[PDB]
Amino acid sequence: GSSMCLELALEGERLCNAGDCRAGVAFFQAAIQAGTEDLRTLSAIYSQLGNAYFYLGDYNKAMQYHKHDLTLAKSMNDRLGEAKSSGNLGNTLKVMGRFDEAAICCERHLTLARQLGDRLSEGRALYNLGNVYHAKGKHLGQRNPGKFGDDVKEALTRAVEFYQENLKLMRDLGDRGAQGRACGNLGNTYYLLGDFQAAIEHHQERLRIAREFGDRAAERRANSNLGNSHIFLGQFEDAAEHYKRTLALAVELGEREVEAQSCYSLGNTYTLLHEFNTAIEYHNRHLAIAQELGDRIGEARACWSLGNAHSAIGGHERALKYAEQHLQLAXXXXXXXXXXXX
């Protein structure tokens, strides 16, 4: 009964782990129905339901069940458990764009962790608050792209502070991989702030750490962020090197979409470098992938770029064909380039 619940809940857990989360949710619900006297078990079922709904994209449900877990955890005076629930709920609220509320939940996690003297839990809370403010400033910037307001800078600034606090604690604890995560997010946040030199330094440390761990994916990310940072410092040769490294990693990892974007970035960067032939090879690569992937929007960008690249070298007729291709795919801009080449 309580044992019925237990078996149902364990099968629920096992099924989410094996990536059958929709069936898992059904077992958690059967387990609730069967009922139990053990609050620690019930609370764990609420939590697993909240995470399974999160992963399935049902954020309202996830929020509901995390809340049930949270409330039950207060009611059981399980402080470490309450801290987890708060962290989970805060994460859910963050994804829903409910940043004020998310921050409150994540502060609570931080408060409890420090009361308990649980440094790893404190670290996590700091990283999560970093994520809330980073997502908030990113969102504010996107929602009004034509302005770079105090609200954006303020959000990103708090994010920097939390990430730095996290990084320092991660250094004190000697948690190398966690240092790598903090550097990556700090690098991103400074990059949004426009402190491109600070972003560089943090992405570089991120790359070093990734290499220590043989973490190729993190290496790819870091090299990509570096390339972008270099572009934003006017350092075009460094950018080209980092994009090429990105490209080589993306081929090794079989990330075809990322291989495409790296190629497109290299075409642009070589155009700035006035290496039109070399740009054209990179753009040709991007174009072929975009075609293979049925990504028409990329195919238009490629045609647009390739039209320009060809004219630049007097390849005027070829240029015309890409411009016409761009028109089809697309309109205003291609018509002008198609007219200008006649």
Binding site: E13, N51, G87, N88, N185, N225, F232, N268
Partner: peptide, 28 residues
């Protein structure tokens, strides 16, 4: 409009974020 300026402008708000899930699991 110019493809290079357009590309660079798109890059301004780009960045590969850290990907580790921070959800916490309560074991049954």
């Amino acid at each position: 409009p110019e493809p290079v300026a357009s590309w660079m402008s798109e890059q301004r708000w780009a960045g590969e974020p850290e990907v580790m899930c921070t959800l916490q699991h309560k074991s049954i």
